[PDB]
Design a protein around this ligand. Structure first.
Ligand SMILES: Nc1ncnc2c1ncn2[C@@H]1O[C@@H]2COP(=O)(O)O[C@H]2[C@H]1O
Ligand SMILES: Nc1ncnc2c1ncn2[C@@H]1O[C@@H]2COP(=O)(O)O[C@H]2[C@H]1O
Ligand SMILES: Nc1ncnc2c1ncn2[C@@H]1O[C@@H]2COP(=O)(O)O[C@H]2[C@H]1O
Lengths: 200, 200
């Protein structure tokens, strides 16, 4: 991948342990990132710091792109390493020079913006159409259809903490706890184990 | 406008769409890029029961139908419907990609708008997640008060909007919108006069 490697030679590259914060919402946006290895969560918060994950981003993903096309913008979200990460960074100013040399690097970036918009639009859809019970139910169902969902004699089973579920739908761990109990008692799932079984 | 947009537009056909006509249908094969020369549109998606949600309004100078551009074989991710009479330039993706090669600035213009839509749709996903239906409505009326067609008034801004529209934006029924709008004007936050609302 000649264009990528060229792009990266113009970056500086650093390692970040899991749980460390790469981007703080509200900071001035002046640099672009690219994930060389690992995974990050893109997070927003309510006024009391309850979190919602807008996306996971993985190796090959650009981050910090949204301040690129107009000066004076702030980071729109927190971005937090979910595993140990290797992350390339480059100033918007140097990136813009790179685009002049070869606009393919802009194509790649824009393709990812367009995917993100489709996915975030779909999520806003579910947030409008579903209450917190439906959100959690549709999350568990989505997760059971993932390539990594394990077969179970009674349906599919998943590994996912209550806090992670809470991050997906933007509710507390305890709210998740209560609604999982309700869904168990409605005979839709079982969560009495260290994992979750979605029936059917 | 500038010589670059005019260059781009001379490679487009201009089509007219009457108010309430659909420009783009969800699920259609995406092979075409659009640009709004005049007028305004609504972007909509739907739940399995035919409930509609307004993801966004877009206006003169806005690109539409861009999300299929970066990868072949995609579907339209939403319906796009004329809110007023519209004049809309259109061009095939393939021909757009050729233009990008002559002058990458036209891709820059487009990517700028994608970045803005991702910021706006993320903030909206947060609203839907974190706010109760009343907070969604009170935030929506501010956002509406800075659409191109929301003009001034002694005690703040003034807008025209239906209950159905608001309900489509925040995710609730007209009836519920009616009850909340009533609450909001007791809380001396607005005054309503038919379909026209003054936002303080
Ligand atoms: N809805 C989203 N989906 C995926 N990534 C996002 C989303 N919102 C923000 N981001 C990423 O989080 C970053 C926060 O900083 P920026 O606003 O500079 O750029 C942002 C994007 O790279
Ligand atoms: N969240 C959004 N904000 C603004 N416009 C959007 C949004 N989602 C979809 N659209 C527009 O609606 C169009 C539907 O067709 P496309 O998916 O080709 O391209 C889409 C975008 O131009
Ligand atoms: N709970 C909901 N979540 C998302 N959208 C809704 C919900 N309830 C109603 N809507 C949509 O918003 C519209 C507002 O006007 P109507 O009540 O005619 O029809 C409504 C539905 O299409």
């Amino acid at each position: 991948d000649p264009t990528l490697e060229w792009f990266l030679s113009h970056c500086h590259i650093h390692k970040y342990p899991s749980k460390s914060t790469l981007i703080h919402q509200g900071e001035k946006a002046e640099t672009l990132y690219y994930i060389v290895k690992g995974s990050v969560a893109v997070l927003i918060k309510d006024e009391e710091g309850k979190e919602m994950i807008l996306s996971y981003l993985n190796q090959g993903d650009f981050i910090g792109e949204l301040g690129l096309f107009e000066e004076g913008q702030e980071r729109s979200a927190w971005v937090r390493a979910k595993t140990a990460c290797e992350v390339a960074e480059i100033s918007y100013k140097k990136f813009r020079q790179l685009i002049q040399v070869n606009p393919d690097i802009l194509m790649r970036l824009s393709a990812q913006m367009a995917r993100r918009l489709q996915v975030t639009s779909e999520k806003a859809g579910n947030l409008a159409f579903l209450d917190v019970t439906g959100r959690i139910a549709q999350t568990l169902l989505n997760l059971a259809k993932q390539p990594d969902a394990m077969t179970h004699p009674d349906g599919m089973q998943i590994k996912i903490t209550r806090q992670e579920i809470g991050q997906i739908v933007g509710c507390s761990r305890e709210t998740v706890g209560r609604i999982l109990k309700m869904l168990e008692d409605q005979n839709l799932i079982s969560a009495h184990g260290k994992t979750i079984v979605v029936y059917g």
